[PDB]
Design a protein around this ligand. Sequence first.
Ligand code: KOJ
Ligand code: KOJ
Ligand code: CU
Ligand code: CU
Ligand code: CU
Ligand code: CU
Ligand code: ZN
Ligand code: ZN
Ligand code: ZN
Ligand code: ZN
Ligand code: ZN
Ligand code: ZN
Ligand code: ZN
Ligand code: ZN
Ligand code: ZN
Ligand code: ZN
Ligand code: ZN
Ligand code: ZN
Ligand code: ZN
Lengths: 283, 283
Amino acid sequence: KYRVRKNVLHLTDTEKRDFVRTVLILKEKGIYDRYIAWHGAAGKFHTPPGSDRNAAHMSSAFLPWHREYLLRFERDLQSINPEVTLPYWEWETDAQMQDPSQSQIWSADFMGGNGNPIKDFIVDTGPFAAGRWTTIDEQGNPSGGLKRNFGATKEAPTLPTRDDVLNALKITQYDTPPWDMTSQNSFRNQLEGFINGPQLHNRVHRWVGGQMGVVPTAPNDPVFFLHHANVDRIWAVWQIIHRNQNYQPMKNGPFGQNFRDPMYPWNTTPEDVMNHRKLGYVY
Amino acid sequence: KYRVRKNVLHLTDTEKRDFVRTVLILKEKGIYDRYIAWHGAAGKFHTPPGSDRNAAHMSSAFLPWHREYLLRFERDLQSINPEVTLPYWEWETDAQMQDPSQSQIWSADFMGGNGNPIKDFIVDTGPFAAGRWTTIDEQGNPSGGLKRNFGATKEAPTLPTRDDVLNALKITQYDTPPWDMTSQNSFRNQLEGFINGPQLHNRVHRWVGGQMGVVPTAPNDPVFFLHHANVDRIWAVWQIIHRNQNYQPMKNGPFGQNFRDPMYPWNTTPEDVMNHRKLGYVY
Ligand SMILES: O=c1cc(CO)occ1O
Ligand SMILES: O=c1cc(CO)occ1O
Ligand SMILES: [Cu+2]
Ligand SMILES: [Cu+2]
Ligand SMILES: [Cu+2]
Ligand SMILES: [Cu+2]
Ligand SMILES: [Zn+2]
Ligand SMILES: [Zn+2]
Ligand SMILES: [Zn+2]
Ligand SMILES: [Zn+2]
Ligand SMILES: [Zn+2]
Ligand SMILES: [Zn+2]
Ligand SMILES: [Zn+2]
Ligand SMILES: [Zn+2]
Ligand SMILES: [Zn+2]
Ligand SMILES: [Zn+2]
Ligand SMILES: [Zn+2]
Ligand SMILES: [Zn+2]
Ligand SMILES: [Zn+2]
């Protein structure tokens, strides 16, 4: 219970500089690519085969999978600079702004801004603009540059709201069968964003656009980790709120979705990451 | 140095009936799929991006990657039945037969035979015939059944020979820059099969045909593990023959291909698996 993950808006001008700095090093070393690849692989790993569920999304493992993912990422950051932890982007507050694209998270010294229309939506500002940050496509081949198109889609013109988060925290079940996109009264499916989709998690992805808008390339954008840090935080909150509800399914769910099954591409299980405090961090 | 890995031809009927039994259980539990997925993911993970190299092939990590792969596979088998270890298919010997398709490895009680032309070359005999063993395509979706077409291609009508193996063992360097398909005088590139390709390792894949003939689906066929057990054995032999030769490169090679880099999709390094015997097994 020592690493503290902070709200992006609470970070020092130097804490942000170091976070960005460390992400570039991870990228330069070739470590960052392993994360893009891991997420892409998991997204194509259906549980079971032919199904709509995959190791990292559209099922119960969605939350514990990304928590493990973030922990790994944070440990690598820690290996470069032990002062650096994973911050979270509290999008539900940014949603209140007149124009969310003006949030400090998109400043040139931190994530950079929206995509450039005259450039096809090719982020040209910030530390990860094309020319300073390589991207890979779904095939694993270089792609030419990060793209973003804030709220351009008709389905997700706006970021999720505080109300949306609060209502989700009200659900009593972690998840419910058939443990997939159609699950009802499921905190997991709700937070993920499938109830009246796209909502919450899925909605942020859709709102950002660019690589963030699709599963196979999403992690190409560093904000992916800031997004999922908030999703993880929301889950940690839900866990304290319903301290007597536990992960589901415990058994008889698809292999890879049960409480003690390994989560492809790793051997770690949901049980292994149920208590974030045990993982060494708090929000 | 305790688990003993045997020549398929030295296995009793019971040892074979047990190996097959255990592979089916692994399959039924959903573990077997994790291996298909791991190999497919590694094959699409280029080091570096845009390059021709991958995490499991066409570069220095080819040998230590598959050794780790088999070790993990063997441990899972061991978890099901502690008396079952990974056998090896000594194709060099089978190459001497008038008709290699008559080798006991393809018996109906073990790997099953060649594909059925009428069926489009679907394997209809043995424990893994279509109907008894599911497969998946490159996309992770069910594919309908294992296929094999022994020596059907013009490039690999025959299995590699003893001479081919012996000549490879004479190579003095583990590998040589640029640590890829074009490497010359390298044991790794030679054994892999790129010198006057397709030879040795690549040749067996090509000879078997079906899913075994292509990178993204090759593990779908259980013989994949018997093949790679022999390739691993050949490397173990090379290691004793050149007691004073070590893995290459140790540094300044592409991330993931260096002596102490993690090998996607895992964190294990070539150093971690250099001594097979410290892994708990011998041939
Ligand atoms: O719920 C949804 C989420 C997303 C985001 O990728 O896209 C479409 C949806 O319907
Ligand atoms: O050298 C080769 C190796 C392989 C194996 O996949 O296929 C074709 C080749 O020419
Ligand atoms: Cu995702
Ligand atoms: Cu996501
Ligand atoms: Cu192979
Ligand atoms: Cu292969
Ligand atoms: Zn704070
Ligand atoms: Zn898919
Ligand atoms: Zn909130
Ligand atoms: Zn409750
Ligand atoms: Zn907490
Ligand atoms: Zn023997
Ligand atoms: Zn017999
Ligand atoms: Zn037999
Ligand atoms: Zn031999
Ligand atoms: Zn000869
Ligand atoms: Zn040995
Ligand atoms: Zn020598
Ligand atoms: Zn290991």
